[PDB]
Amino acid sequence: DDWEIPDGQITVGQRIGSGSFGTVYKGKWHGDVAVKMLNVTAPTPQQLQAFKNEVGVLRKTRHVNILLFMGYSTKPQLAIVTQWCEGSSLYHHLHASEKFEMKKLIDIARQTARGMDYLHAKSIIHRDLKSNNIFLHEDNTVKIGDFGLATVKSRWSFEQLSGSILWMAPEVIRMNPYSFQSDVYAFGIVLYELMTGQLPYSNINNRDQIIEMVGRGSLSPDLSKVRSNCPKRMKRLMAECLKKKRDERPSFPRILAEIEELAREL
Numbered sequence: 001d002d003w004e005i006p007d008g009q010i011t012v013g014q015r016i017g018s019g020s021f022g023t024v025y026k027g028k029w030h031g032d033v034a035v036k037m038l039n040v041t042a043p044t045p046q047q048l049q050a051f052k053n054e055v056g057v058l059r060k061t062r063h064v065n066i067l068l069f070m071g072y073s074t075k076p077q078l079a080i081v082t083q084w085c086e087g088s089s090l091y092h093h094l095h096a097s098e099k100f101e102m103k104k105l106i107d108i109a110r111q112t113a114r115g116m117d118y119l120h121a122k123s124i125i126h127r128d129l130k131s132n133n134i135f136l137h138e139d140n141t142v143k144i145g146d147f148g149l150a151t152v153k154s155r156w157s158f159e160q161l162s163g164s165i166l167w168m169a170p171e172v173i174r175m176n177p178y179s180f181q182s183d184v185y186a187f188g189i190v191l192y193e194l195m196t197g198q199l200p201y202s203n204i205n206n207r208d209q210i211i212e213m214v215g216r217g218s219l220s221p222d223l224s225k226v227r228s229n230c231p232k233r234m235k236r237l238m239a240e241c242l243k244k245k246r247d248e249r250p251s252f253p254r255i256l257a258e259i260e261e262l263a264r265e266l
């Protein structure tokens with residue numbers, strides 16, 4: 001409520017990309033900020049109460065490895081204001097184009113697992129984990145985005161599957177469906193991206209082919225492409241996260257404990 005940034009305080013600039021329910025912009029309001037412009041303009045009584053409940057959730061769910069909520073807007077569009085992360089997204093680094101030392105590669109995974117251990121402990125299902133939602137704030141601390149509006153994601157379904165699907169668990173394709181284990185699968189794809197510097201199924205230039213094959217469980221990421229310097233324990237953890245049978249996947253407590261243990265390596 002006292003989190004509503006008043007009319008004409010944020011200077012909306014450079015279009016960054018598009019998160020869950022909105023479009024991200026680089027803004028300015030007492031320094032650098034990020035603004036997610038939601039696709040809602042004239043909020044009805046129910047719409048405005050729904051959005052204010054998620055803002056109440058946003059100001060109650062704080063963590064060093066999840067994006068920092070700064071406030072909201074109602075005019076001219078419903079928007080979410082967060083902290084700005086100067087080092088952009090992990091996708092931007094890894095894929096566009098190449099390099100990080102094995103220590104750092106393990107450190108991002110570790111910090112993503114730390115944030116996700118916090119989100120799962122607050123009974124929040126992320127629904128949309130990907131490298132484009134993992135931001136490098138520097139202080140050199142990973143920041144998880146798109147975790148908010150979780151109840152709105154549950155109340156709806158999503159069709160905005162493309163352009164994504166790469167981090168979607170097989171059960172999420174063949175439409176339970178979203179769980180903590182589906183979040184573990186997306187994290188497994190993140191681990192793949194980290195240890196391989198490539199996206200899964202980068203040879204395919206078609207969507208419905210990936211939907212049929214990943215969904216039926218005939219396709220999966222090519223693990224043979226893992227770096228030679230990737231420790232054994234990490235290639236194994238990655239496989240456990242990516243397991244087709246959803247209830248075989250590890251929990252974030254066990255995920256984090258494996259990363260902590262394999263980080264030594266002194």
Ligand SMILES: CCCS(=O)(=O)Nc1ccc(F)c(C(=O)c2c[nH]c3ncc(Cl)cc23)c1F
Binds near residue numbers: 016069084089
């Ligand atoms: C505390 C709520 C976070 S969120 O779940 O609603 N997701 C969200 C909301 C608003 C945003 F601007 C962003 C976002 O993408 C960024 C926040 N800070 C950033 N810094 C750099 C880049 Cl490239 C992107 C962002 C974002 F991920």
